[PDB]
């Protein structure tokens, strides 16, 4: 049932993540926070130019296997 998507960091390196479309992006964000050394309040994710909201399931965004999600540094101004 789970599938594999890619999250890419500011440096350009993609990593694989096994996820389910019923998981929330808050759950994916904690997997991403685990692989790199960054905490959830320091970044936000985009797919196809649009942000991913924390409390919504991944299936709301049309992710297919090896879809590439981008990590964006959460600025503090």
């Amino acid at each position: 049932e789970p599938l594999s998507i890619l999250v890419r960091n500011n440096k350009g390196r993609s990593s694989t993540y096994e996820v389910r479309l019923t998981q929330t992006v808050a759950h994916l964000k904690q997997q991403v926070s685990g692989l790199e050394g960054v905490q959830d309040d320091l970044f936000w994710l985009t797919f196809e130019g649009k942000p991913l909201e924390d409390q919504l399931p991944l299936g709301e965004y049309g992710l297919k296997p090896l879809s590439t999600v981008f990590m964006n540094l959460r600025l503090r101004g």
Partner: protein
């Protein structure tokens, strides 16, 4: 020595609670708001009997059901955050600088001044969530307290702390829809898989995080395909009433001598890895109006790290 109050979530459906003068609201019922004020840690008395109070915690199923109809699929924490953020922001003020409305600096709220002033130029959007649209309509009428607090609560912003204006601006727009037509057609292809057209409509065709200029949006992109090869993607049609592009802070020299295409943009001051400052800018009458949280100054040239860039309408077709 007993009072009866009416708790509500929507101001239309009420439910009574009998309370005593011995314990406080929080122990008997939960956190409650009376005329915008938290009274959860006060002991009830006669001046509350008969009046309605807005319950924030410990909601029942039927009040939760009404909560989701008014604010959308929100999380149990939401209502407390919203009510508390609204009372904390009460002191903030919107000040008119050069015939427009801007938000004065208080408690690191400059990222919000960028968000709200960029939204104020989008004059063809509405929100699908009722509470949000009501707050948005009130903000456009004068009182912005509700609208400020709501986008703070929807954006998971902590009070008095700096945040990311592009994050919040695009998060808020994901809750909005467009009152006119808009269309964006991507052409994807892979030498092994084939060619496919992806079509986006409405407000979703007017925002994109990842590029900051219309040339870079229309450029051909290349990424790994599900087969293992390299898939390509390129814009082939675009018609919008405006276009909002956001990226990381990118140093540019914006000048009015070459008459730029964009109508407005946001600037980050400082370095990305530390706490910086946001400034909103519009172009009017051959000058750049800089809006630094309740103050305004004009310049002809500015070296600055831009983030969000708002363009006018897009009429494009290629290939």
């Amino acid at each position: 020595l007993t009072i009866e109050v009416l708790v509500t979530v929507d101001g239309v459906n009420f439910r009574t609670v009998v309370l005593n003068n011995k314990n406080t609201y929080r122990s008997q019922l939960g956190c409650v708001f009376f005329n915008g004020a938290d009274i959860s840690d006060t002991i009830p008395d006669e001046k509350q009997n008969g009046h309605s109070l807005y319950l924030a915690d410990n909601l029942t199923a039927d009040e939760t059901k009404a909560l989701k109809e008014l604010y959308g699929p929100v999380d149990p924490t939401f209502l407390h955050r919203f009510y508390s953020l609204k009372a904390a922001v009460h002191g903030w003020k919107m000040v008119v600088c050069d015939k427009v409305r801007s938000l004065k600096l208080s408690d690191n709220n400059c990222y919000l001044n960028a968000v709200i002033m960029t939204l104020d130029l989008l004059k063809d959007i509405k929100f699908v969530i009722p509470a949000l649209q009501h707050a948005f309509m009130k903000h456009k009428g004068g009182d912005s307290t509700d609208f400020i607090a709501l986008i703070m609560a929807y954006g998971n912003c902590t009070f008095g702390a700096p945040d990311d204006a592009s994050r919040l601006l695009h998060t808020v727009l994901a809750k909005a829809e467009l009152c006119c037509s808009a269309r964006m057609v991507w052409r994807e292809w892979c030498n092994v898989c084939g060619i496919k057209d992806v079509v986006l409509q409405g407000l979703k065709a007017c925002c994109y995080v990842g590029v900051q200029t219309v040339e870079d949006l229309r450029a051909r992109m290349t990424y790994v395909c599900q087969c293992g090869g390299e898939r390509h993607r390129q814009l082939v049609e675009h018609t919008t009433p405006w276009l909002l592009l956001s990226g990381t802070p990118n140093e540019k020299l914006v000048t009015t001598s070459t008459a730029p295409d964009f109508v407005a943009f946001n600037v980050f001051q400082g370095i990305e890895t530390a706490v910086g400052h946001y400034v909103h800018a519009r172009l009017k009458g051959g000058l750049i109006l800089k809006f630094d949280s309740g103050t305004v100054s004009k310049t002809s040239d500015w070296k600055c790290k831009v983030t969000d860039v708002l363009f006018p309408g897009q009429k494009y077709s290629s290939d």
